[PDB]
Amino acid sequence: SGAIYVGNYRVVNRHLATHNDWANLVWEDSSRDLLVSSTTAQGCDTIARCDCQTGVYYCSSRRKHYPVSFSKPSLIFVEASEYYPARYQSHLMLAVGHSEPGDCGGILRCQHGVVGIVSTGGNGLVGFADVRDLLWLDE
Numbered sequence: 001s002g003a004i005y006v007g008n009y010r011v012v013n014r015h016l017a018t019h020n021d022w023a024n025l026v027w028e029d030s031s032r033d034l035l036v037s038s039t040t041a042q043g044c045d046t047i048a049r050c051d052c053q054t055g056v057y058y059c060s061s062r063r064k065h066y067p068v069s070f071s072k073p074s075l076i077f078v079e080a081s082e083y084y085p086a087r088y089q090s091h092l093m094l095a096v097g098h099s100e101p102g103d104c105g106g107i108l109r110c111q112h113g114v115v116g117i118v119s120t121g122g123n124g125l126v127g128f129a130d131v132r133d134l135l136w137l138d139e
């Protein structure tokens with residue numbers, strides 16, 4: 001679990017969105033596993049606007065932050081699950097690192113701010129859904 005709070009928005013993994021998230025929906029994309037809902041209170045997370053490939057992510061299954069090198073956002077195959085059929089998830093970035101299904105939502109940050117959230121994993125790898133291109137989260 002985990003969310004990004006920026007302005008009047010809440011950013012979560014689409015496969016983990018609540019009833020409240022869907023009743024206050026702003027935008028959603030199954031192909032990115034992202035969902036954005038509106039909030040009453042203000043959010044103080046800063047989104048990075050950069051092409052950084054290094055950063056730190058929170059891993060809840062270890063209660064630890066890990067530094068990582070990560071790939072550029074791209075279309076990557078993701079095996080079927082209870083939430084989606086087997087497909088290409090777009091805007092996905094991979095790193096060598098530990099993750100388990102309950103790790104989705106952990107924030108990945110660089111020196112510029114929030115880069116994205118844990119969305120995939122398996123075989124000593126961790127996948128992050130990028131949010132750096134969502135320029136509207138600030139305006």
Ligand SMILES: CSc1ccc(Br)cc1CC(=O)N1CCC[C@H](C(N)=O)C1
Nearest residue numbers: 033081099100101103104119120121122
């Ligand atoms: C950090 S998630 C994870 C980590 C290790 C292992 Br084994 C398995 C997982 C689970 C996982 O990758 N998915 C299930 C939830 C939907 C995800 C998606 N974005 O399509 C795919």
Ligand SMILES: [Zn+2]
Nearest residue numbers: 050052110112
């Ligand atoms: Zn950066």
